[PDB]
Design a protein around this nucleic acid. Structure first.
Ligand SMILES: Nc1nc2c(ncn2[C@H]2C[C@H](O)[C@@H](COP(=O)(O)NP(=O)(O)OP(=O)(O)O)O2)c(=O)[nH]1
Ligand SMILES: [Mn+2]
Ligand SMILES: [Mn+2]
Ligand code: NA
Ligand code: NA
Length: 326
DNA sequence: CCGACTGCGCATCAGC
DNA sequence: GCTGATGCGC
DNA sequence: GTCGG
């Protein structure tokens, strides 16, 4: 929070360009610039000082000079007063509603939380549940609660089959004192890059977590990914725990390391590592790191036996999960 | 300058 | 139905 | 919006 005001400004501009302008590269530009300022260990005294950082160009430097001088940005002030921009920015805060749908809704007169509740028939499933838990999804999850949810998931998964390995990744694995949601990597010996010897491997886990009333809703569900809602059990007389977003990602057993690297994050850390890999002539996804041929086409999966192995190829000194919070 | 910008799963729709 | 594009989110 | 080529 050394430069909270600056990175908040850029995050806001990023949110604007994505939700309103629908210029995803501008969104990413501000995301990257915000991240690199966020870790810079000095209080920034000028735009030119920030201009020295990778990802901070002239337009952002000019804005940084304005913010430091006046305490705010005129461009953001205007965007805030704007009705259409403010409305779209709100609608996109509902999970399932993106820039397109939000703009599509405003065209109809649906631009408030009240408008959505009387028009739930105009939402698809994801959007209806996102609306349903709009409040709970705005709350953070204390790590103490995260440890609770970890015990349930890892134990319920043990009961379906003792060979399931479940690892809570995301910001939790990065050691965050509080998380926005729960991310769970899942591995079973039947599912590898070679064969799917067992069908319904992820379904049986979802099924079980529903049976004990942990998973309460589903946003989307497939053979390898689950997006849904979960809730901790409360004791007698206590007010219920808020409903929480939960992601579950089944990844082939022999590709656990590329999987856990991906799922641990952060989202920008992954953006920067995959960008660095390309320059080094490699491409990383959640499954494999692969070299690029002379034509650019990816080659065969290189051998990986640890997270650090992936860092080795692209010539990065290993960074533990808590040092990936970019 | 100016092309290129991380990589992909699930829902949904256009088109056949 | 399939296939590919798009929308949204991880 | 930024940057390497
Ligand atoms: N490569 C890549 N990975 C991503 C991206 N977005 C997310 N991931 C991967 C890396 C992310 O770390 C992981 C989980 O995504 P979240 O739950 O949405 N974010 P997190 O747990 O980091 O923070 P929070 O406490 O607020 O929930 O999925 C992306 O855009 N690109
Ligand atoms: Mn998360
Ligand atoms: Mn998540
Ligand atoms: Na710069
Ligand atoms: Na949204």
């Amino acid at each position: 929070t050394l430069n909270g005001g600056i990175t908040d400004m850029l995050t806001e501009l990023a949110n604007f360009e994505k939700n309103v302008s629908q210029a995803i590269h501008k969104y990413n530009a501000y995301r990257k610039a915000a991240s690199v300022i966020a870790k810079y260990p000095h209080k920034i005294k000028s735009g030119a000082e920030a201009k020295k950082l990778p990802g901070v160009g002239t337009k952002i430097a000019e804005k940084i000079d304005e913010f430091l001088a006046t305490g705010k940005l005129r461009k953001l002030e205007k965007i805030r007063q704007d009705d259409t921009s403010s409305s779209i920015n709100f609608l996109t805060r509902v999970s399932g509603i993106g820039p397109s749908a939000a703009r599509k809704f405003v065209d109809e007169g649906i631009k408030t939380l009240e408008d959505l509740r009387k028009n739930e028939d105009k939402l698809n499933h994801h959007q209806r549940i996102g609306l349903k838990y709009f409040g709970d999804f705005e709350k953070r999850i204390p790590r103490e609660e995260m440890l609770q949810m970890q015990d349930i998931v890892l134990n319920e998964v043990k009961k379906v089959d003792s060979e399931y390995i479940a690892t809570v990744c995301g910001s939790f694995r990065r050691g965050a004192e509080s998380s926005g949601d729960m991310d769970v990597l899942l591995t079973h010996p039947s599912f590898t890059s070679e064969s799917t010897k067992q069908p319904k491997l992820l379904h049986q886990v979802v099924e079980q977590l529903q049976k004990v009333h942990f998973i309460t809703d589903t946003l989307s569900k497939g053979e390898t990914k689950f997006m849904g809602v979960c809730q901790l059990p409360s004791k007698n007389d206590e007010k219920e725990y808020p409903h929480r977003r939960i992601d579950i990602r089944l990844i082939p057993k022999d590709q656990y390391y590329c999987g856990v690297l991906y799922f641990t994050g952060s989202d920008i850390f992954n953006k920067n590592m995959r960008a660095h890999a390309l320059e080094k002539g490699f491409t990383i996804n959640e499954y494999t790191i692969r070299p690029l041929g002379v034509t650019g086409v990816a080659g065969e999966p290189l051998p990986v036996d640890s997270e650090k192995d992936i860092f080795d190829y692209i010539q990065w000194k290993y960074r533990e999960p808590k040092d990936r919070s970019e």
